[PDB]
């Protein structure tokens, strides 16, 4: 039903938002956004900065990411992954718009971008995810 949304997908570097609720019967006014960052790129990804902002009428509750760099993908070995968990507290149940900032270095370049994610599940579904 509710699928991961792709926030970034280039060069083999993928940042996805996975939606969930706490697996124990909890409140349908908080969204668990699990951010996965997986690289299958042939070069290391370093100095990864992924920041998020959301409207004042809901609290962000960002926690630190599991890491900041990803090694070059090689078919022999395990692809590494960064996880980061956001708890999106939206009791007024307004439309969720997230502003993100992405910065990283790969090869001989530094990549910077910022944008809006607007594909959050309807607040009504928070409890049945």
UniProtKB/Swiss-Prot annotation:
Record localization: Golgi apparatus, trans-Golgi network membrane; Endosome membrane; Early endosome membrane
Cite the GAE domain residue spans from the record: 1-121
**Annotated source species:** Homo sapiens
Question: How is this protein named in the record?
Answer: ADP-ribosylation factor-binding protein GGA1
Instruction: Give the UniProt tissue specificity note.
Output: Ubiquitously expressed.
Q: What does UniProt say on post-translational modification here?
A: Phosphorylated by CK2 and dephosphorylated by PP2A. Phosphorylation of GGA1 allows the internal DXXLL motif to bind the VHS domain and to inhibit the recognition of cargo signals.
Domain of life here? Answer: Eukaryota
Domains (record comment): The VHS domain functions as a recognition module for sorting signals composed of an acidic cluster followed by two leucines (DXXLL motif). The GAT domain is responsible for interaction with ARF-GTP, UBC and RABEP1. Required for recruitment to the TGN it prevents ARF-GTP hydrolysis.
Family affiliation: Belongs to the GGA protein family.
Quaternary state and partners of this protein? Monomer. Interacts with GGA2 and GGA3. Binds to clathrin and activated ARFs, including ARF1, ARF5 and ARF6. Interacts with RABEP1. Interacts with RABGEF1. Interacts with the type-I membrane proteins LRP3, M6PR/CD-MPR and IGF2R/CI-MPR. Interacts (via N-terminal VHS domain) with SORL1/sorLA and SORT1 (via C-terminal cytosolic domain). Interacts with EPN4. Interacts with CCDC91. Interacts with HEATR5B/p200a. Interacts with SYNRG/gamma-synergin. Interacts (via GAE doamin) with NECAP1 and NECAP2. Interacts (via GAE domain) with AFTPH/aftiphilin. Interacts with TSG101 and UBC. Interacts with RNF11.
- Functional description taken from the UniProt entry: Plays a role in protein sorting and trafficking between the trans-Golgi network (TGN) and endosomes. Mediates the ARF-dependent recruitment of clathrin to the TGN and binds ubiquitinated proteins and membrane cargo molecules with a cytosolic acidic cluster-dileucine (DXXLL) motif. Mediates export of the GPCR receptor ADRA2B to the cell surface. Required for targeting PKD1:PKD2 complex from the trans-Golgi network to the cilium membrane. Regulates retrograde transport of proteins such as phosphorylated form of BACE1 from endosomes to the trans-Golgi network.
What does the annotation give as the result of altering residue 62 to E? Abolishes interaction with CCDC91
